[PDB]
């Protein structure tokens, strides 16, 4: 992307955490940069803004100074460091840009890095292959997938063939099971002729648990 946001996945309430955001294809030295967080449920909240030479720094009243925002032009990195963390603070953090001599309104947003504070400990995901049944002759279309189970906290990144396969892919929203752990299924539809000829590998990554799995799905014998 242009703004990539590498930061912490899980932390304990009362502890600290430093978020970083890097700019790649634009200059990033004449653009005002800000940090804006959205909690799931589609509630958008602006927490901080910093000027081109860090002369003007603005923070939200909920934060009251608890966060410190700085930026480095040489390394093209925006830093937001959070001293005190609460359960309400758990949210998706967006690295946001401003508009060159037009307005003080925002224009571009990064992918977003979500921080989740919880007393609970991190748990790695278990991946199990969803093999496609033999059916639909040759003119029909079949589907195959991957099952992610028992992971905390959110989120998990699931892709196919390292991003080579992006069409017909459905990554279902994580559902919360009774054990308290998350579980989701990622499926994809492909032509029947492709099976046995084409290799389908789903890559699942869980940043807080440091779990990087490249899992291959072949039809069951």
């Amino acid at each position: 992307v242009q703004l990539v946001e590498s930061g912490g996945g899980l932390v304990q309430p009362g502890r600290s955490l430093k978020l970083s955001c890097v700019a790649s294809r634009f200059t990033f030295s004449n653009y005002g940069m800000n940090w804006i967080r959205q909690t799931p449920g589609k509630g958008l909240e602006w927490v901080a803004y910093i000027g081109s030479t860090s002369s003007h720094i603005y923070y939200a009243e909920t934060v009251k100074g608890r966060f410190t925002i700085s930026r480095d032009n040489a390394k093209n990195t925006l830093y937001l460091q959070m001293t005190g963390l609460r359960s309400e603070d758990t949210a998706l953090y967006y690295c946001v840009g401003h508009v060159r001599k037009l307005g003080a309104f925002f224009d571009y947003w990064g992918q977003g890095a979500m921080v989740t504070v919880s007393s609970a400990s991190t748990k790695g995901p278990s991946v199990f292959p969803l093999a496609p049944s033999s059916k639909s002759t040759s003119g029909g279309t079949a589907a195959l997938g991957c099952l992610v189970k028992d992971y905390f906290p959110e989120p998990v990144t699931v892709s196919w063939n390292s991003g080579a396969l992006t069409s017909g892919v459905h990554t279902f929203p994580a559902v919360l099971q009774s054990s308290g752990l998350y579980s989701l299924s990622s499926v994809v539809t492909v032509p029947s002729s492709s099976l046995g000829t084409q290799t389908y590998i789903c890559n699942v990554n869980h940043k807080p648990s440091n779990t990087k799995v490249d899992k291959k799905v072949e039809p069951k014998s």
């Binding site: 589609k42 958008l44 992918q111 189970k149 279902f172 299924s185 499926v187």
Partner: protein
């Protein structure tokens, strides 16, 4: 401290018709508003600046209307990819930046029958002690769908969990996954596993099964 109120929270319209999203400002902002569109599973992007001027890459369909206290966003002949959540933005008050509550725009497309698939638990998950059988509905409309599990003609309840994806940005269709979680023991206690789907797109409930 300025207050950005946005109503109604959720909206819906057919394909090809227009939509008007209202945004109200507490301090009668002097035409200093921005409209942002957030696609499903994606970061929000700028749609309209100055509350009446279109952004460089966005299509002419989106329009900015209104001033002072009241603003409106107009979408003309919206396509399947227009499914999104829209927010407002004020820059009149520099110290505190505030957004709107957000309008959830859904769409109305013609009926689509789901393609049913059934997935047995892997033999590596049998070493875990738990078995997961997955039912798949891929591209259907509307969201309303009945998925029931059938084992040796037994209606399973309290063990299954459903999950519906967000509306696709290409065909505006929904995807549902019905996950059935059992123990390894009971997984091997029974012979046939079946999934029955009843949907508006189907003339009659489509069942798909396997005998392991």
């Amino acid at each position: 401290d300025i207050q950005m109120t946005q109503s109604p929270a959720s909206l819906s319209a057919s394909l090809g018709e227009t939509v008007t999203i209202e945004c109200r400002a507490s301090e009668d902002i002097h035409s200093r508003l921005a409209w942002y569109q957030q696609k499903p599973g994606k970061s929000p992007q700028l749609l309209i600046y100055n509350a009446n001027s279109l952004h460089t890459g966005v299509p002419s369909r989106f329009s900015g209307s209104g001033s002072g206290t009241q603003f409106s966003l107009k979408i003309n002949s919206l396509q399947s990819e227009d499914v999104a959540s829209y927010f407002c933005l004020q820059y009149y008050n520099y110290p505190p930046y505030t957004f709107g509550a957000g309008a959830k725009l859904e769409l109305r497309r013609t009926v689509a029958a789901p393609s049913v698939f059934i997935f047995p638990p892997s033999d590596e998950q049998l070493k875990s002690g738990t078995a997961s059988v997955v039912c798949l509905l891929n591209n259907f409309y509307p969201r309303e769908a009945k998925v029931q599990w059938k084992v040796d003609n037994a209606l399973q309840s309290g063990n299954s969990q459903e999950s519906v994806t967000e509306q696709d940005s290409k065909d505006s269709t929904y995807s549902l996954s019905s996950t059935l979680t059992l123990s390894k023991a009971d997984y091997e206690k029974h012979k046939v596993y079946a999934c029955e789907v009843t949907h508006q797109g189907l003339s009659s409930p489509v069942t798909k099964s396997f005998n392991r």
